[PDB]
Ligand binder design. Structure first.
Ligand code: JKY
Ligand code: JKY
Length: 282
């Protein structure tokens, strides 16, 4: 079908749970043997969320190359993304090692450090200019350069220094701060505005390594971000934009990381965002 009328037809028929379950049944399953080795237990936030062996990001260090992160490579759209969990106390140095080694220009954060009264990820970036962070395990230094706080999202400029070579790079931190503790946003307007700010920065462009995208597990909100971006790019590239099938794009992305889009409400929100984004583009 076409998207907007498939949308009203699922709303009128109340069948979001049945559509979402179909996706879960058809999704790829591949080995995640490295994630499950006992030496990696303290490198995983959740025992049921693991990167596939075939698409996992490898750290350039012989002792242990493991991080809970996946390369999502979208061939027709010509976009790549790294999707990862929120960093743990023991993995903040590995996180910045990956950003360095992969040549990323941007980090996209879709959660707060505390939500529902519990910690969802480590405080992994500095809050004050004059109080920089040193990761002794990974031999990196990170400095806050500037911060711009807006009503729905904050953008930070950071300096990452490789202490071994004294090389420096500028990293942009895009922090969506208003996703609700329960459910999904009522309107996709502020999420789409945010996506457009990340695009305008150059962080998603082929000149740079892939953007790093995370939430708590790196599958739900993170899934929604990459699914909306890829669907809107395909609608611009193709002769017939009504040919873009959001369910088929999501199953292609699930070949590279398990579990992307965690609820029927996140699936409906992804359709809503693509439908409203397609009108703004023209
Ligand atoms: C997690 S796993 O790698 O052990 N399972 C995936 C799987 C899919 C299909 C077949 Cl035929 C066999 C295995
Ligand atoms: C390779 S490095 O210089 O960036 N840091 C050392 C290191 C990295 C990763 C692990 Cl798992 C252990 C040690």
């Amino acid at each position: 079908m076409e998207m907007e009328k498939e949308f009203e037809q699922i709303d009128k028929s109340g069948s979001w749970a049945a559509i979402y379950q179909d996706i879960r049944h058809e999704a790829s399953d591949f080995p995640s043997r490295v994630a499950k080795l006992p030496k990696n237990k303290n490198r995983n936030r959740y025992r049921d969320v693991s990167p596939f062996d075939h698409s996992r990001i490898k750290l350039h260090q012989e002792d242990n190359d493991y991080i809970n992160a996946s390369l999502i490579k979208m061939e027709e759209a010509q976009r790549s993304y790294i999707l990862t969990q929120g960093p743990l106390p023991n993995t903040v140095g590995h996180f910045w090692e990956m950003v360095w080694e992969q040549k990323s220009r941007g980090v996209v954060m879709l959660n707060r450090v505390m939500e529902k009264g519990s910690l969802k990820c480590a405080q992994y970036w500095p809050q004050k200019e004059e109080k920089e962070m040193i990761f002794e395990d990974t031999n990196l230094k990170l400095t806050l350069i500037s911060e711009d706080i807006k009503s729905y999202y904050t953008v930070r400029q950071l300096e990452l220094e490789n202490l071994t070579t004294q090389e420096t790079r500028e990293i942009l931190h895009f922090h969506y701060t208003t996703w609700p503790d329960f459910g999904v946003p009522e309107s996709p307007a502020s999420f789409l505005n945010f996506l457009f700010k990340v695009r305008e920065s150059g962080s998603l462009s082929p000149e740079h390594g892939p953007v790093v995208v995370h939430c708590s597990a790196g599958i739900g909100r993170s899934g929604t971000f990459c699914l909306a971006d890829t669907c809107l790019l395909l609608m611009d590239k193709r002769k017939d934009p009504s040919s873009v099938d959001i369910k088929k794009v999501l199953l292609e992305m699930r070949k590279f990381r398990m579990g992307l889009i965690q609820t029927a409400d996140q699936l409906r929100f992804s359709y809503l965002a693509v439908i409203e984004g397609a009108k703004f583009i023209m």
